[PDB]
Amino acid sequence: PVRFVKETNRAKSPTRQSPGAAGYDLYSAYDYTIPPGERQLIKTDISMSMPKFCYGRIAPRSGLSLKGIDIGGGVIDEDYRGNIGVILINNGKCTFNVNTGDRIAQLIYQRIYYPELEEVQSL
Amino acid sequence: PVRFVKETNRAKSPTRQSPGAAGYDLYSAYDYTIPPGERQLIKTDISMSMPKFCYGRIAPRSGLSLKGIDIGGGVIDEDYRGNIGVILINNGKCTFNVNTGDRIAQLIYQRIYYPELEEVQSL
Amino acid sequence: PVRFVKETNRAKSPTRQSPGAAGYDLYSAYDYTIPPGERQLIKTDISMSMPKFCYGRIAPRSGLSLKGIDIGGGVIDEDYRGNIGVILINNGKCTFNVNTGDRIAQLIYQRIYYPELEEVQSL
Ligand SMILES: O=c1ccn([C@H]2C[C@H](O)[C@@H](COP(=O)(O)NP(=O)(O)OP(=O)(O)O)O2)c(=O)[nH]1
Ligand SMILES: O=c1ccn([C@H]2C[C@H](O)[C@@H](COP(=O)(O)NP(=O)(O)OP(=O)(O)O)O2)c(=O)[nH]1
Ligand SMILES: O=c1ccn([C@H]2C[C@H](O)[C@@H](COP(=O)(O)NP(=O)(O)OP(=O)(O)O)O2)c(=O)[nH]1
Ligand SMILES: [Cl-]
Ligand SMILES: [Mg+2]
C-alpha cells in the first residue's frame, strides 16, 4: 500500500486507467499557461511515501507528447515527502492550456537497485 | 518469453546487440522525412504482450542523441496490443531521414510496481 | 558491490545523499561551455562494471531541469566498460557553463528484464 496526502482539496487522487497500465495518472491542482518553447512546474498538491527500493518516474502521456509536450526532471525519490511537481515543456507550436484537474503526466513506480560503490584501479 | 507479431512483412524482430545490452532494437518499417524543430511518429509494425509487472520504455540511441534526435512519450504498457510507435523529435538543425530498416530507438523492459493507493492525512 | 575506476584525478567518485535517494551524483571532469540550443557530451571520467539484470540511467537533476537543462541518450548498458558521458542539452535562454567538479546528473540503477522473444500469429 502506498500512502498519499492531498495538501489541498484541489488535488485529485492519482488513478490507473487500466489493470495493465504502467503508471498512475497525475492531475494539475491549478491553472497554468505554457508558451511555445517554455516550461512550467505544475503542482499536483499530492505528497506520498514511496515504496522501498524504487522511485517514481514522472512519465509523459502519449497524446500530449504528440502535441509537442515533453517532461523535464521527473525523479521522485523514495524519501521525497513534499509536493510532487510535473515539469511540462511546451515544445509545440501553440500555447498549452492547463486547467485544474487536467491529466498532465503519469507516475510510474520503477524498481531500482541501491548498490555499494567501491573504487578500484582496473575492472 | 515475450510474444510478438509482425503486422506487416516490413516489421523487423527486435534484437539485442549483446547479452549485456539493456534494450532491444526497434526498426522503422516506413520511410520518413523530419525537418528541424519537428517530431514524427514512426511505426514499427510490431505488437507484443509485455512481461507482467513491467513496461516498455522507448529509449534513445546514443548515436542519434548526439545529432540532436530525442524521444517523445515512450511508455509501452503491459496490456498494450496495438502497433508500437516511436516519437522521434528532431531538435537538430538539419532534416533527419528515416529509412525502412533504420534502428530508431531501443525498447527497455523496466521492472515496476503496481501498488494499491490509500488516502491519508499525515505521512 | 559495483566496482568503478577513475580514468584521471579529474574524475569524482559518485555520491549518495540519503537512504531514499534515487541514485548517484555524476560530476564533470572537464570545463564546457554549452550555448543555447546546443547539446554537449560531458565526460565524467568514470568507468564502472554495472550490476546484472539492470542499467544505469543518466537522469536529470531538477534544479538544472528548471533552468532548461535536459538529458540526452543516457542509457548505460550492463557491459559498458567505457567512460560514462552525460549529454547535457541547453534548452534554456542563456549560455550554460560547466566547471570541473560540477554536479551534472544522477545515475539510477534501474531493474530490467532480458526475455527471449517469440514471433507469433495472434496475441
Ligand atoms: O511513444 C509511444 C507512447 C505510447 N504508445 C502506445 C503504447 C501505450 O500502451 C499506449 C498509450 O495510449 P494512451 O494515450 O491511451 N495512454 P497514455 O499512458 O499515453 O496516457 P493517458 O492514458 O493519460 O491517455 O500507446 C506508443 O506506441 N508509443
Ligand atoms: O519533476 C520533479 C522533479 C523533482 N521533484 C522533487 C523530487 C526531489 O527530491 C526534489 C529535488 O530536490 P533537490 O534539492 O535535491 N534538487 P537538486 O537539483 O539538488 O537534485 P535532484 O533534483 O536530482 O534531487 O524535487 C519533483 O517534485 N518533480
Ligand atoms: O548518454 C550516454 C549514453 C550512452 N553512453 C554509453 C553507454 C552505452 O553502452 C554506449 C551506447 O552505445 P553505442 O556507443 O554503441 N551507440 P549505438 O547507437 O551503437 O548503441 P546504443 O543504441 O546503445 O546507443 O555509450 C554514454 O556514455 N552516455
Ligand atoms: Cl526510465
Ligand atoms: Mg494510460
A96 — phi, psi (to 5°)?
Answer: -110, 120
A118 — phi, psi (to 5°)?
Answer: -130, 125
> Between chains, do B21 and C110 touch, taking CB under 8 Å as contact?
no
Half-sphere exposure of residue C98: CA atoms within 13 angstroms, side-chain side: 26
The three cell numbers locating residue A37: 518553447
Give the three-class secondary structure for C24: strand
DSSP C92-120: SSSPEEE-TT-EEEEEEEEEB--PPEEE-
Q: Which of A18, A62, A86, A102 to mutate to test the pocket of ligand 1 (most atoms within 8 A of CB)?
A: A62
Atom 12, ligand 3: residue with shortest CA distance? B62
Q: Could you give the angle at the alpha carbon of B21 between the alpha carbons of B20 and B27, nearest 5°?
A: 155
d(C-alpha A37, C-alpha B87), whole Å: 18
d(C-alpha C56, C-alpha C97), whole Å: 25
CATH topology of domain A1-123: Deoxyuridine 5'-Triphosphate Nucleotidohydrolase; Chain A (2.70.40)
The three cell numbers locating residue A69: 509536450
Rg (CA), chain A: 16
Neighbours of C31 (CB within 10 A): 10
Q: Which of B4, B28, B77 to mutate to test the pocket of ligand 1 (most atoms within 8 A of CB)?
A: B77
CB C90 within 8 A of CB A102: no
Closest Cβ opposite residue B66 in set C87, C114, C122: C87
The DSSP 8-state label assigned to residue C60 in this structure reads -
d(C-alpha C117, C-alpha A107), whole Å: 28
d(C-alpha A65, C-alpha A55), whole Å: 22
Nominal resolution in Å?
2.5
- For chain C, domain boundaries: 1-123
Task: Work out which ligand 1 atom sits closest to the CA atom of B58.
Answer: 1
d(C-alpha A63, C-alpha B43), whole Å: 16
Distance of CA C15 to the CA centre of its chain: 13
Cα–Cα distance list, C120 to A15, B10, C117 (Å): 33, 15, 10
Residue of B nearest to C91 (CA): B91
Task: Report the gap between the CA of A122 and the closest CA in chain B (Å).
Answer: 19
d(C-alpha B96, C-alpha B36), whole Å: 8
* Residue A81 identity: R
Q: Is the dihedral of CA A50, A68, B69, C63 positive or negative?
A: negative
d(C-alpha A109, C-alpha A58), whole Å: 9
B4 vs C contacts (CB less than 8 Å): 117-120
Report the candidate in B109, B88, B94, B95 with the shortest Cα–Cα distance to residue B24: B109
Q: Could you give the angle at the alpha carbon of B59 between the alpha carbons of C86 and B4, nearest 5°?
A: 155
Rg (CA), chain C: 16
Task: Report the gap between the CA of A117 and the closest CA in chain C (Å).
Answer: 5
Burial zone of C63 (CB within 10 Å; 0-12 exposed, 13-18 middle, 19+ buried): exposed
Task: Work out which ligand 2 atom sits closest to the CA atom of C59.
Answer: 23
C54 vs A contacts (CB less than 8 Å): 112-113
Size of chain C, expressed as the number of residues it contains: 123
The three cell numbers locating residue A113: 537497485
Q: Is the dihedral of CA A52, C58, B54, B91 positive or negative?
A: positive
